[PDB]
Design a protein around this ligand. Sequence first.
Ligand SMILES: O=C(NCc1ccccc1)c1csc(N/N=C2\CCCc3ccc(-c4ccc(OCCc5ccccc5)c(C(=O)O)n4)cc32)n1
Ligand SMILES: O=C(NCc1ccccc1)c1csc(N/N=C2\CCCc3ccc(-c4ccc(OCCc5ccccc5)c(C(=O)O)n4)cc32)n1
Lengths: 141, 140
Amino acid sequence: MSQSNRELVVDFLSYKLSQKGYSWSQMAAVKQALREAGDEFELRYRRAFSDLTSQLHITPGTAYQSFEQVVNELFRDGVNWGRIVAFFSFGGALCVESVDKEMQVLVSRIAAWMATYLNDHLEPWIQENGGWDTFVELYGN
Amino acid sequence: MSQSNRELVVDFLSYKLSQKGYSWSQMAAVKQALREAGDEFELRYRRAFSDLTSQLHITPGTAYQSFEQVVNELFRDGVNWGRIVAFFSFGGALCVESVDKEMQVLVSRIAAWMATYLNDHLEPWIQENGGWDTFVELYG
Ligand SMILES: O=C(NCc1ccccc1)c1csc(N/N=C2\CCCc3ccc(-c4ccc(OCCc5ccccc5)c(C(=O)O)n4)cc32)n1
Ligand SMILES: O=C(NCc1ccccc1)c1csc(N/N=C2\CCCc3ccc(-c4ccc(OCCc5ccccc5)c(C(=O)O)n4)cc32)n1
């Protein structure tokens, strides 16, 4: 119950500060930058590219390594911030299609796969290019 | 500082799911009822009351006890769902003033004080009045 209470407070204060357009922490600023970049990417750029969800055809039998081999296609010509945004959008799309197909049980493993891929394959590039601070500096507020 | 790749993932996926009417967490209906009740309270009903923030000057040296004794004033004549809503709004107002004062870092402290107050002073009343799912039935 105590953890739920904390979660209510955090949600309420985040929502209220966001509603006023206030940036209160580097973490909040990174998350806001990513949300907005994903929205812009999905609206106006994603349809130009081959649909990576068509390569995975996620099932409850899909393993991390199958996700990883499909994501490697997105980074076949290297890492940039745009492709990192596209990676988040791809994960978001796997979750949305999972829930659309009455397989919400996949949502938690998709999140773990995304974390694993970021930590294993993108973290060195992120640090080399000024960390998430630079992402916010170029694409945030 | 964003010192967690997993936190960015969970945040982004929560957002993307919400845009399709789907929920990351089970607390989703309460969060949506509390945000809407907060917005509604602040837009007109709040204007009737003395501004409780004028009694607090939150700095890195302010004790939890100072916050606790000002918040108690909300519940002087009992706990009800509206006063719980007002408590959250009050918390939100404190955070906005904290950022405006260049004390952004105190937002997380205020969050910690609110969760502490909620757990000590309000959790018993909440349990004894049908929990958050009643709040959702009334304000959702
Ligand atoms: O979500 C996805 N699919 C599901 C879906 C749902 C609904 C509709 C369509 C598809 C998804 C995300 S991704 C993707 N395929 N992309 C691939 C295919 C494999 C190879 C590949 C190779 C490079 C790139 C890529 C992606 C983004 C890129 O930049 C984005 C710039 C930007 C940033 C912020 C906001 C707007 C725009 C770039 C680039 O410019 O280098 N290059 C992308 C794919 N599919
Ligand atoms: O955020 C606050 N202040 C900063 C601020 C910013 C901008 C503008 C004005 C103030 C704030 C939240 S609070 C407050 N002071 N309120 C006090 C003063 C001390 C005594 C006190 C005592 C009872 C109540 C109270 C609060 C809410 C209440 O019900 C709300 C019902 C409702 C729900 C959903 C939507 C709309 C309305 C009630 C009640 O009717 O019981 N009673 C309230 C204060 N200040």
